[PDB]
Design an enzyme around this catalytic site. Structure first.
Site, PDB file in Angstrom:
ATOM      1  N   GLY A  98      57.122  74.436  16.854  1.00  0.00           N
ATOM      2  CA  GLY A  98      56.625  73.199  16.254  1.00  0.00           C
ATOM      3  C   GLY A  98      56.097  73.274  14.838  1.00  0.00           C
ATOM      4  O   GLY A  98      56.690  73.934  13.980  1.00  0.00           O
TER       5      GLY A  98
ATOM      6  N   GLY B  27      54.152  76.771  14.330  1.00  0.00           N
ATOM      7  CA  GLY B  27      54.888  77.986  14.437  1.00  0.00           C
ATOM      8  C   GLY B  27      55.436  77.967  15.835  1.00  0.00           C
ATOM      9  O   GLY B  27      55.911  76.967  16.281  1.00  0.00           O
TER      10      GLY B  27
ATOM     11  N   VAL C  56      55.362  79.516  20.072  1.00  0.00           N
ATOM     12  CA  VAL C  56      54.651  80.051  21.225  1.00  0.00           C
ATOM     13  C   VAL C  56      55.662  80.921  21.957  1.00  0.00           C
ATOM     14  O   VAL C  56      56.756  80.449  22.295  1.00  0.00           O
ATOM     15  CB  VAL C  56      53.996  78.963  22.122  1.00  0.00           C
ATOM     16  CG1 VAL C  56      53.378  79.582  23.377  1.00  0.00           C
ATOM     17  CG2 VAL C  56      52.939  78.194  21.341  1.00  0.00           C
TER      18      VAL C  56
ATOM     19  N   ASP D  93      43.561  64.833  21.507  1.00  0.00           N
ATOM     20  CA  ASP D  93      45.027  64.694  21.575  1.00  0.00           C
ATOM     21  C   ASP D  93      45.538  64.894  22.999  1.00  0.00           C
ATOM     22  O   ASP D  93      46.519  65.606  23.224  1.00  0.00           O
ATOM     23  CB  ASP D  93      45.774  65.623  20.591  1.00  0.00           C
ATOM     24  CG  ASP D  93      47.190  65.136  20.239  1.00  0.00           C
ATOM     25  OD1 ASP D  93      47.497  63.942  20.489  1.00  0.00           O
ATOM     26  OD2 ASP D  93      47.992  65.952  19.745  1.00  0.00           O
TER      27      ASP D  93
HETATM   28  N1  LIG Z   1      48.060  75.817  22.035  1.00  0.00           N
HETATM   29  C1  LIG Z   1      48.556  76.204  22.985  1.00  0.00           C
HETATM   30  C2  LIG Z   1      49.179  76.704  24.154  1.00  0.00           C
HETATM   31  C3  LIG Z   1      50.586  76.560  24.352  1.00  0.00           C
HETATM   32  N2  LIG Z   1      51.184  77.103  25.419  1.00  0.00           N
HETATM   33  C4  LIG Z   1      50.423  77.806  26.276  1.00  0.00           C
HETATM   34  N3  LIG Z   1      51.023  78.401  27.395  1.00  0.00           N
HETATM   35  C5  LIG Z   1      52.279  78.310  27.947  1.00  0.00           C
HETATM   36  O1  LIG Z   1      52.612  79.000  28.907  1.00  0.00           O
HETATM   37  N4  LIG Z   1      53.108  77.379  27.351  1.00  0.00           N
HETATM   38  C6  LIG Z   1      54.414  76.970  27.793  1.00  0.00           C
HETATM   39  C7  LIG Z   1      54.953  77.442  28.995  1.00  0.00           C
HETATM   40  C8  LIG Z   1      56.232  77.067  29.359  1.00  0.00           C
HETATM   41 BR1  LIG Z   1      56.959  77.738  30.982  1.00  0.00          BR
HETATM   42  C9  LIG Z   1      56.997  76.238  28.576  1.00  0.00           C
HETATM   43  C10 LIG Z   1      56.472  75.758  27.392  1.00  0.00           C
HETATM   44  C11 LIG Z   1      55.182  76.097  26.991  1.00  0.00           C
HETATM   45  N5  LIG Z   1      54.651  75.465  25.840  1.00  0.00           N
HETATM   46  C12 LIG Z   1      55.143  75.942  24.543  1.00  0.00           C
HETATM   47  C13 LIG Z   1      54.334  75.441  23.349  1.00  0.00           C
HETATM   48  C14 LIG Z   1      53.992  73.961  23.492  1.00  0.00           C
HETATM   49  C15 LIG Z   1      53.182  73.713  24.742  1.00  0.00           C
HETATM   50  O2  LIG Z   1      52.953  72.316  24.935  1.00  0.00           O
HETATM   51  C16 LIG Z   1      53.802  74.285  26.000  1.00  0.00           C
HETATM   52  C17 LIG Z   1      49.036  77.940  26.071  1.00  0.00           C
HETATM   53  N6  LIG Z   1      48.414  77.380  25.030  1.00  0.00           N
END
Ligand SMILES: N#Cc1cnc(NC(=O)Nc2cc(Br)ccc2N2CCC[C@@H](O)C2)cn1
Length: 270
Positions: A16, A19, A21, A120
């Site tokens: 995004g 950067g 994740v 948000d």
């Molecule tokens: N800031 C923050 C953040 C973003 N993601 C986190 N943990 C995840 O495990 N994220 C995640 C897991 C899976 Br399966 C698929 C997508 C994500 N995200 C990626 C970044 C955007 C977030 O909304 C969710 C924890 N904190």
């Protein structure tokens, strides 16, 4: 133990403004964490994250700075976003939405109790672990609204337009807590109807005008049962001083309606 500090970045979970994740896996223990990589805002996100510890708030493990790049070690939620559990124009089963809404309230009560406003709240910022437990995510827009038991009124314009409270658009200053309550009401609407009621809560927005004129025979309201709809009538109130508070949301009839069975535990007969 040698090599415990080494993490392999095995896949991109999301990309995004910030950067990316990445899913990080420990070389020795195979523990999975989410690493938020921010190439230099982040200083306040780390500072707010260091204050947090609740079962419905994404865990903060630590941070590492490599030059101008910050590495945020956050909780891996394998269930992904609540957003992808919402079926377009349908929503999800009412008992699933109630359980997610209970967990959302527990997280928000915790944050407000320590003087933090997320600012948000939306289904893209509500993550699910392997057991479908909801966790409030991303404190990049969060701020302290209460310090030394003194409330600070907010004036900064932020959030996401379909989820923002109308006072943020009409007033110079506003209380932090009713704004997060409103966005939780839009999240509840999305979970029960699979659609957002308006582009923004302004008089110029026809769908917002219809809601204020109580035209609940229109979409998305007509897809929602009268008990959660009566709760939405108390959350989505234009005047933030008259809007329901979280202590009163916990007293709402639908909020306390028995609907969902606990997770099916293994059983055998004879
Ligand atoms: N800031 C923050 C953040 C973003 N993601 C986190 N943990 C995840 O495990 N994220 C995640 C897991 C899976 Br399966 C698929 C997508 C994500 N995200 C990626 C970044 C955007 C977030 O909304 C969710 C924890 N904190």
């Amino acid at each position: 133990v040698p090599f415990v500090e080494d993490w392999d970045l095995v896949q991109t979970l999301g990309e995004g403004a910030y950067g990316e994740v990445q899913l990080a896996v420990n070389r020795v223990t195979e523990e999975a964490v989410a690493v938020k990589i921010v190439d230099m805002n982040i200083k306040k996100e780390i500072c707010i994250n260091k204050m947090l510890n609740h079962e419905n708030v994404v865990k903060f493990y630590g941070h590492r700075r490599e030059g101008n790049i910050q590495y945020l070690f956050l909780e891996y939620c394998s269930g992904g976003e609540l957003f992808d559990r919402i079926e377009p124009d349908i929503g999800m089963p009412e008992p699933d939405a109630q359980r997610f809404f209970h967990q959302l309230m527990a997280g928000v009560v915790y944050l407000h109790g320590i003087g933090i406003t997320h600012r948000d709240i939306k289904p893209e910022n509500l993550l699910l672990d392997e057991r479908d437990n909801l966790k409030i995510s991303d404190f990049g827009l969060a701020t302290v609204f209460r310090y030394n038991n003194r409330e600070r009124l907010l004036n900064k314009m932020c959030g996401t337009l379909p989820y923002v409270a109308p006072e943020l658009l009409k007033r110079r200053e506003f209380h932090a807590e009713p704004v997060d309550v409103w966005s939780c009401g839009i999240v509840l609407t999305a979970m029960l109807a699979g659609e957002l009621p308006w582009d923004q809560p302004s008089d110029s927005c026809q769908e917002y005008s219809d809601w204020k004129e109580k035209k609940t025979y229109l979409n998305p309201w007509k897809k929602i049962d009268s008990a959660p709809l009566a709760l939405l009538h108390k959350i989505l109130v234009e005047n933030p001083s008259a809007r329901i508070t979280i202590p009163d949301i916990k007293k709402d009839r639908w909020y306390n309606k028995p609907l969902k069975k606990g997770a099916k535990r293994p059983r055998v007969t004879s």
